[PDB]
Design an enzyme around this catalytic site. Sequence first.
Site, PDB file in Angstrom:
ATOM      1  N   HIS A  93       0.886  -1.172   0.179  1.00  0.00           N
ATOM      2  CA  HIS A  93       0.057  -0.120   0.245  1.00  0.00           C
ATOM      3  C   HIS A  93       1.023   1.094  -0.047  1.00  0.00           C
ATOM      4  CE1 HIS A  93      -3.300  -2.432   1.167  1.00  0.00           C
ATOM      5  NE2 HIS A  93      -2.496  -2.924   1.758  1.00  0.00           N
ATOM      6  N   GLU A 103      -0.676   1.826   6.133  1.00  0.00           N
ATOM      7  CA  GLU A 103      -1.621   1.282   6.897  1.00  0.00           C
ATOM      8  C   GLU A 103      -1.771   1.726   8.312  1.00  0.00           C
ATOM      9  OE1 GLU A 103      -3.211  -2.281   4.525  1.00  0.00           O
ATOM     10  OE2 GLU A 103      -4.715  -0.575   3.830  1.00  0.00           O
ATOM     11  N   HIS A 116       3.020  -6.261   2.543  1.00  0.00           N
ATOM     12  CA  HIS A 116       2.333  -7.066   3.493  1.00  0.00           C
ATOM     13  C   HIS A 116       2.213  -8.763   2.952  1.00  0.00           C
ATOM     14  CE1 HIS A 116      -1.272  -3.901   4.837  1.00  0.00           C
ATOM     15  NE2 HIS A 116      -0.487  -4.155   5.199  1.00  0.00           N
ATOM     16  N   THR A 195      -7.006  -5.956   5.899  1.00  0.00           N
ATOM     17  CA  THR A 195      -7.768  -4.070   5.129  1.00  0.00           C
ATOM     18  C   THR A 195      -7.841  -3.936   4.250  1.00  0.00           C
ATOM     19  OG1 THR A 195      -5.540  -3.816   4.246  1.00  0.00           O
ATOM     20  CG2 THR A 195      -5.356  -3.947   6.914  1.00  0.00           C
TER      21      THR A 195
HETATM   22 ZN   LIG Z   1      -2.122  -5.072   2.464  1.00  0.00          ZN
END
Ligand SMILES: [Zn+2]
EC number: 4.2.1.1
Length: 257
Positions: A93, A103, A116, A195
């Site tokens: 992200h 995040e 991630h 998320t």
């Molecule tokens: Zn993610």
Amino acid sequence: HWGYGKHNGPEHWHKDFPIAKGERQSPVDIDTHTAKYDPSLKPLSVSYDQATSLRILNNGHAFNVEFDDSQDKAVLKGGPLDGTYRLIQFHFHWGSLDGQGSEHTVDKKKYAAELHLVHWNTKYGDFGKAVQQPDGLALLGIFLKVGSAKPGLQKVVDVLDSIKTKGKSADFTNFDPRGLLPESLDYWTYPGSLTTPPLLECVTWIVLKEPISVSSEQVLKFRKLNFNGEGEPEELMVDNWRPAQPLKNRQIKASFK
Ligand SMILES: [Zn+2]
């Protein structure tokens, strides 16, 4: 459908996914002074030596580097985890500018981006079954700051031109994700969620304290990606992050003193 635009972004998600207002949503702000060292936490075990990457995909909200998870190869174990979790994909992200993009936040600090690495609990047989369990996934989160280039990231950045738009994929074999890890495996951990929709509350979060450094040129290339499909009006893929959610009845534990 959901996205990160002005009319379908995170503040709208609850309408299709009511769990968005749930009791264990992610990401969260990590308050470093309130997180308690937990001497019972074990060292993380990241075994990526046998990781087999296959493909990279622009899915309209990020790009996923996908791995062969049909065998027990790339696995995450130890730390707060019981059992073995298999690497299935990683993605990032990021922001429109260096001052936002992550995040999770640390004492409200936003990083330029967040990696991630997604792993599923092998005791549930497949990813689809795992996401229906409270301990179904383990997500390893790694912050990115802008500075020196990350050599191990360059093979990812150079392939992005070939998957500019939603639905495009490219062969991506033999990529070694060990090249994305920081020196230290010190981490914070808490129970949370995916998320992105469906926002399932099936994730043990392990967020590394040490960020990796990437260059301005590297992150700029992330920001040349498109949310849109081929031939559609260009919407740059930037600011594809969900903001911090209420911590509610949860404790964030630190692996380090
Ligand atoms: Zn993610």
